Design an enzyme around this catalytic site. Sequence first.
Site, short mmCIF file in Angstrom:
data_model
loop_
_atom_site.label_atom_id
_atom_site.label_comp_id
_atom_site.label_asym_id
_atom_site.label_seq_id
_atom_site.Cartn_x
_atom_site.Cartn_y
_atom_site.Cartn_z
CE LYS A 52 -25.05 -6.05 12.53
NZ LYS A 52 -26.21 -6.76 11.93
CG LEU A 54 -25.54 -17.02 13.06
CD1 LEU A 54 -25.52 -17.72 11.70
CD2 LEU A 54 -24.17 -16.93 13.73
CB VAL A 57 -26.96 -12.21 15.57
CG1 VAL A 57 -26.30 -11.38 16.65
CG2 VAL A 57 -26.91 -13.69 15.91
CE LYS A 64 -25.90 -5.73 24.12
NZ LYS A 64 -27.16 -4.99 24.29
CB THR A 93 -37.48 -17.87 41.63
OG1 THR A 93 -38.15 -16.82 40.97
CG2 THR A 93 -37.22 -19.00 40.66
CB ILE A 98 -42.17 -17.82 44.79
CG1 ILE A 98 -42.80 -17.76 46.20
CG2 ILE A 98 -41.94 -16.39 44.25
CD1 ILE A 98 -41.77 -17.61 47.27
NE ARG A 175 -34.15 -41.07 30.69
CZ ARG A 175 -34.30 -39.77 31.01
NH1 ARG A 175 -35.39 -39.07 30.72
NH2 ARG A 175 -33.30 -39.14 31.64
CG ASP A 182 -40.32 -34.60 40.04
OD1 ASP A 182 -40.23 -35.52 39.27
OD2 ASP A 182 -40.18 -33.36 39.76
CG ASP A 184 -43.76 -37.56 36.74
OD1 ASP A 184 -42.67 -37.33 37.19
OD2 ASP A 184 -44.18 -37.24 35.57
NA NA Z 1 -40.79 -21.13 42.34
ZN LIG Z 2 -43.22 -34.63 37.96
#
Ligand code: NA
Ligand SMILES: [Zn+2]
EC number: 2.7.7.7
Length: 327
Positions: A52, A54, A57, A64, A93, A98, A175, A182, A184
């Site tokens: 706290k 902090l 905080v 909690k 998700t 989504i 790298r 993916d 890019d």
């Molecule tokens: Na998504």
């Molecule tokens: Zn990308």
Amino acid sequence: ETLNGGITDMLTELANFEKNVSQAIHKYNAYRKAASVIAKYPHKIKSGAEAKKLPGVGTKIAEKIDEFLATGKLRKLEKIRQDDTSSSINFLTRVSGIGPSAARKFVDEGIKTLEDLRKNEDKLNHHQRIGLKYFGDFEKRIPREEMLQMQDIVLNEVKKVDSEYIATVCGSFRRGAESSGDMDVLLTHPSFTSESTKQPKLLHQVVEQLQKVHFITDTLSKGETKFMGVCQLPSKNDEKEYPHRRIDIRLIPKDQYYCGVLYFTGSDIFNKNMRAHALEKGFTINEYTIRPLGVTGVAGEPLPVDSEKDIFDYIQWKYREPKDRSE
DNA sequence: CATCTG
DNA sequence: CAGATG
Ligand code: NA
Ligand SMILES: [Zn+2]
Ligand code: NA
Ligand SMILES: [Zn+2]
């Protein structure tokens, strides 16, 4: 970094849900600063009260932490981990296209699972559609071994189209990275620049070719500088077809490639450090350019770059192979 | 940040 | 045009 891990981890678990399940953006924002500070804190928090102490905080978050320390769990965390509705948003998700907003509405209409989706393919839009179609494949990491074959193809075709094309496969793969998520590709033409007024064909031509010869399968989004798509390595001798992979291609004015190139390659960590030093050395650095710091506070004016070579030099640094661009 | 949906 | 998603 591990002295206050569980603490930060739950805080994250909490922040996250506030944001995605509830709408509690503030709440959510709270858990985050908190987790941020406690992360930095050099001691092992032995109590809420100590915590706290902090900034970020407060009372609730302290609360909690006590309960967490005091007992190996958290009622609320446990309470949330069960609940099918929460779990749903989390799931839904995972499908490209989504986000939480959507995740919400679907659940609210009973769409909770994968089939749920399928049956309601009507309710999904194009991206979302593709998303669902490549659900598994999309979650599949890309072995660098595929990455090279892949990169091979792009680079040739980009080539046949215009010799003046300049493509670059940024990302982790750059790298050293044994596998990426993916692909890019950074892109520029000489005839594309800072003042140079547009040139959409510039991006639109290559995209074509790729799909032309089949490398590109679907289009997710196709703007005038950014193309978001799906691609795939031609299945060889029929038995082993590849997964469908995410792929982005983006046009950049030739006059600010390497900043971008550098930039994309990361790691964020390398970046910061490079950002922090450039600053010492009397400079500025970002996604697009590198400029000379005036003493009046700040000030700008683009420095002229012709390679990642030009940037390092500037802030007078050791050129770093992309392999060792890690931290 | 650029793109899509609606 | 706001608002979503990546
Ligand atoms: Na998504
Ligand atoms: Zn990308
Ligand atoms: Na508003
Ligand atoms: Zn101590």
